[PDB]
């Protein structure tokens, strides 16, 4: 809708197709004619704040949006810098960054496959316990790599995990610009992800914060929907443990691991990714 057309050029880069269009950015499949390789280009584009001009630059929808637009842009830059710290198969690899068209762009590695959200919607029968147990070692590795450098993800759900055709996962996006815009605009609904964010994110954060969201992802894969919103749980905890529900085809060991990651209070969860991984052993 707002996307650059196939054939658009950024010097050596050529746009091939808009493959993702959300409220806050566009993702393109593109081609580097100098290195003769396919890449992705992520374009900052907050549709509530900005529109596409005739010359294909980006312009404010209203002059009052300039401060929030710039703050989102700054957060987009900071996220690119964070991802540029890593060279890990499970984290989105950043090749280049530049500003143009009144906005900003990340050139990144192009990944095969699709999101975990799309895989769960389109092929849920592929997702069983054996598949989940193959997913977890590389997913654990990617998350732990963030933690070991002193950072947290804080936006994990099914929507921003890529599942490659190899089935290996990639963490694509931390939602930084979206969340900054939401906080400044009082659009609270775009900051935290209901059912994935644990209680301490609503206002003490650490690796256990991401571990809860990973538990919520796993819960969604096993029974089809995330657990109750954590603030609602903090009033009256209506979470039914998976070890009691006993969904068909799932071991108590995997179920219990998910339940422990979803402990309401941070101190009751696995405290590190390594601690959570240890729970899946002894079987
Ligand atoms: N580096 C990358 N390589 C390949 N694909 C990517 C990359 N980064 C993001 N994507 C894809 O971009 C899309 C971003 O999803 P978003 O919700 O913004 O767009 P969408 O138009 O709703 O896409 P979808 O087809 O997933 O519904 C996802 O389909 C994701 O797989
Ligand atoms: Mn979609």
Which sequence spans correspond to the domains of the chain? 1-283
Give kind and range of the element (H or E) at residue 39.
strand 37-44
Are 205 and 150 in contact by the 8 Å Cβ rule? The answer is no
Nearest ligand 1 atom to alpha carbon 172: 8
Nearest CA to 200 out of 209, 211, 213 is that of 209
Give the ligand with the smallest distance to the CA of 171. 1
Cα 69 from Cα 165, distance rounded (Å): 36
Cβ(160) – ligand 1 distance below 6 Å = no
Q: Whose CA is nearest to atom 20 of ligand 1?
A: 20
23 lines ligand 1 (CB under 6 A): no
State if residue 59 touches ligand 1 by the CB under 6 angstroms criterion: no
Q: What is the SS3 string spanning 224-283?
A: CCCCCCHHHHHHCCCCCCHHHHCCCCCCHHHHHHHHHHCCCCHHHCCCCHHHHHHHCCCC
d(CA 11, ligand 1 centre) in Å: 24
- Technique employed here was X-ray
Nearest atom, ligand 1, residue 114 CA: 31
Residue 113 Cβ contacting ligand 1 at under 6 Å: no
Is residue 27 in contact with ligand 1, taking CB distance under 6 Å? yes
In whole angstroms, how far apart are CA 236 and each of 60, 140, 225, 241, 256? 44, 30, 19, 14, 21
Question: What Rg value do the Cα atoms of the chain yield, rounded?
Answer: 20
With a 6 A CB cut-off, is 20 part of the ligand 1 pocket?
Answer: yes
If you take atom 13 of ligand 1, which residue's CA is the nearest one?
20
Q: Of the candidates 134, 74, 137, which has an alpha carbon nearest to the alpha carbon of residue 103?
A: 74
Q: In whole angstroms, give the CA distance from residue 93 to residue 122.
A: 27
């Amino acid at each position: 809708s707002n996307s650059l057309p196939s054939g658009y050029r950024f010097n050596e880069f050529e746009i091939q197709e808009a493959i993702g269009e959300g409220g806050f950015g566009i993702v393109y499949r593109a081609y580097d004619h100098q290195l003769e390789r396919t890449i992705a280009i992520k374009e900052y584009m907050p549709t509530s704040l900005a529109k596409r001009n005739d010359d294909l630059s980006i312009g404010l929808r209203g002059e009052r949006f300039g401060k929030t637009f710039q703050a989102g842009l700054n957060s987009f830059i900071q996220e690119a810098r964070l991802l540029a710290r890593f060279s890990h198969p499970g984290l989105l690899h950043v090749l280049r960054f530049w500003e143009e068209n009144g906005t900003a762009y990340m050139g990144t590695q192009f990944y095969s496959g699709t999101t975990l959200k799309n895989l769960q919607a389109q092929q849920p029968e592929k997702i069983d316990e054996a598949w989940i147990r193959r997913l977890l070692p590389p997913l654990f590795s990617a998350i732990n790599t963030i933690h070991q450098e002193g950072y947290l993800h804080r936006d994990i759900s099914l929507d921003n995990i890529q599942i490659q055709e190899s089935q290996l996962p990639v963490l694509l996006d931390f939602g930084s610009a979206r969340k900054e815009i939401g906080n400044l605009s009082d659009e609270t609904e775009i900051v935290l992800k209901p059912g994935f964010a644990p209680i301490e994110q609503y206002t003490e954060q650490g690796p256990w914060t991401d571990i809860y969201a990973l538990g919520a992802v796993l819960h969604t894969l096993i029974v089809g929907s995330p657990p109750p919103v954590s603030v609602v749980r903090s009033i009256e905890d209506s979470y039914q443990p998976l070890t009691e529900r006993r969904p068909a085809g799932y071991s108590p060991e995997l179920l219990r691991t998910v339940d422990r990651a979803l402990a309401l209070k941070p101190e009751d969860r696995p405290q590190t990714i390594d601690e959570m991984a240890e729970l899946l052993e002894h079987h």
